[PDB]
Every structure is written in C-alpha cells, then in structure tokens.
Amino acid sequence: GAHMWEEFETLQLYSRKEGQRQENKNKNRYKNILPFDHTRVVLHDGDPNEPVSDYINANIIMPTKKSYIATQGCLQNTVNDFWRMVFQENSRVIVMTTKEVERGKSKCVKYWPDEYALKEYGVMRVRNVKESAAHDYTLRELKLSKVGTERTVWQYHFRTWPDHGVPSDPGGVLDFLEEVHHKQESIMDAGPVVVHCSAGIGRTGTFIVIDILIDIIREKGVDCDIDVPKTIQMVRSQRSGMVQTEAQYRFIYMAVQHYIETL
C-alpha cells in the first residue's frame, strides 16, 4: 500500500522557548528553525563555567524499536556539543545526508577526523580508523571516547543527493538505508540513529519517514496499512516542518513502492 491518495499541499504548535533564548542564538543554523522543547535533546555534564550548556538544535523522533535524533549540520561552534550529544545518547550510527558544501554554501562543518587520524573535540576524543567508499555513500568507522568509555560510531555519509531536487530514483537511498538498518541491529542496545542535513528538516525528514515506513513493512509485511501523511504529521509533532518539498514527498512514496517491489 504505497499509493499517494493525498497531495502534499494537504499536509498544510508546541513551544520552542529554549531555542529562542539569547544564549542559544548562535547555535542555530537558521534563525527560525528551532527544536520543540518537549522532544529536544537536553545536554548534561556541561562546562560549569558556561551559564547555558544544555542546548543543541536537535530532537528525538520516536515513531508512534528504533528512534532517531534529527539535527542540523554542525556549525564550528556546535561540533563539541554534537559529540556530547552522540556520547550521551549512546548513538552508534550517524546518517549525514549532505555534502559539507553544496552549490558554494556550507551545509555542515567537518566534525570527523581524516582517515587514520584522531582529534579531540572538547572532552570527546574521536579516531577515524577506516573509511569505505561505496557508489552512493562513504562509511567511516569512528571510535569515540570521553578524554576523562570507547565505543564505535559508524558514520554513513550519503554522496549522491543532487544539489537541486531529489534523486530521480530511490535505489541509492534504499541500499544505504538497508546498510544503516543492519548496522544498527548489529550493535546491542544502540541508541537513537542521528540523521542530519543543513537545517535538519527536509532531507533529514525524508530519510527518517522512509526508514519508519520501511521498518513497518519489516514487521508487518508488504500488505500492511501504510499512511504516509499520518506518519509525516506524527514526526512533525516532534520537530517542526519535517519533509519540506513536494518532490521530497513524492520521493517518499517512490522509495517505499520500490522497497515493496524488492520483497
């Protein structure tokens, strides 16, 4: 049941106070794309010299088992906070859906070391022990520990998303999601899968909604009830505006239809 019955325009509020505070202004990539308070990731154990050390522009997405953190690409001044998030939440898989720079605009500040290098990002130590190139993505095997605890964090960095619109077919996204799914399931009690793009809502929302629907089909089979608008509204209750364009909406149905056809 991956048929489109409703048009995107039918898809059409909760507090965002923390994101709005003056102390947090420079932690947002876009002035008006902010995390809801009720699902934001709250960062603990911050530097006690910092009056505000609990904020990152990120939300937990729980499909309503696997959960996600939807976030923006790092800014130079949020790279440390991003690694505090990944550590604290026990995340073991990161899905990066952008290049660092697209059409000459930054979309994410490099927050991982080169292959066979290590860097410390604030209190977090990150070692890149191996990269693997695939046609549609690079996988980086990262080892994360707290400088004062090591665990492997696998970063799947999608390569092939066009700088304009969406991929004209979903094969690359589905191969990538399938590897993500198996890696997450390979790691006992891994935490939420981190997904990001520039703002953390368009590409990030498209990937998370496709993964959620594909996971339903895993549990329930190809004839299960699917409701894409309801699933989008459900994720939108947890971070504002997820799935931004009509092309991304049509791409979601195309991807789930192709997934069904592999079964």
Swiss-Prot record:
Phosphorylated upon activation of the receptor-type kinase FLT3. Phosphorylated upon activation of the receptor-type kinase PDGFRA. Phosphorylated by activated PDGFRB. One of its GO terms (molecular function) is protein kinase binding. Changing N59D: In NS1; common mutation. Changing C197S: Abolishes phosphatase activity. Enhances interaction with NEDD9. Keywords: Acetylation, Cytoplasm, Deafness, Disease variant, Hydrolase, Nucleus, Phosphoprotein, Protein phosphatase, Repeat, SH2 domain. Its main location: cytoplasm. Residues 5-255 form the Tyrosine-protein phosphatase domain. One of its GO terms (cellular component) is nucleoplasm. It comes from the Eukaryota. Widely expressed, with highest levels in heart, brain, and skeletal muscle. The keyword Ubl conjugation does not apply. Changing I60V: In NS1; benign. One of its GO terms (biological process) is negative regulation of chondrocyte differentiation. It is found in: Cytoplasm; Nucleus. Changing Y30C: In NS1 and LPRD1; does not affect subcellular location; decreases protein tyrosine phosphatase activity against CDC73. Acts downstream of various receptor and cytoplasmic protein tyrosine kinases to participate in the signal transduction from the cell surface to the nucleus. Positively regulates MAPK signal transduction pathway. Dephosphorylates GAB1, ARHGAP35 and EGFR. Dephosphorylates ROCK2 at 'Tyr-722' resulting in stimulation of its RhoA binding activity. Dephosphorylates CDC73. Dephosphorylates SOX9 on tyrosine residues, leading to inactivate SOX9 and promote ossification. Dephosphorylates tyrosine-phosphorylated NEDD9/CAS-L. It is linked to LEOPARD syndrome 1: A disorder characterized by lentigines, electrocardiographic conduction abnormalities, ocular hypertelorism, pulmonic stenosis, abnormalities of genitalia, retardation of growth, and sensorineural deafness. Noonan syndrome 1: A form of Noonan syndrome, a disease characterized by short stature, facial dysmorphic features such as hypertelorism, a downward eyeslant and low-set posteriorly rotated ears, and a high incidence of congenital heart defects and hypertrophic cardiomyopathy. Other features can include a short neck with webbing or redundancy of skin, deafness, motor delay, variable intellectual deficits, multiple skeletal defects, cryptorchidism, and bleeding diathesis. Belongs to the protein-tyrosine phosphatase family. Non-receptor class 2 subfamily. The SH2 domains repress phosphatase activity. Binding of these domains to phosphotyrosine-containing proteins relieves this auto-inhibition, possibly by inducing a conformational change in the enzyme. Interacts with phosphorylated LIME1 and BCAR3. Interacts with SHB and INPP5D/SHIP1. Interacts with MILR1 (tyrosine-phosphorylated). Interacts with FLT1 (tyrosine-phosphorylated), FLT3 (tyrosine-phosphorylated), FLT4 (tyrosine-phosphorylated), KIT and GRB2. Interacts with PDGFRA (tyrosine phosphorylated). Interacts (via SH2 domain) with TEK/TIE2 (tyrosine phosphorylated). Interacts with PTPNS1 and CD84. Interacts with phosphorylated SIT1 and MPZL1. Interacts with FCRL4, FCRL6 and ANKHD1. Interacts with KIR2DL1; the interaction is enhanced by ARRB2. Interacts with GAB2. This is Tyrosine-protein phosphatase non-receptor type 11. It comes from Homo sapiens.
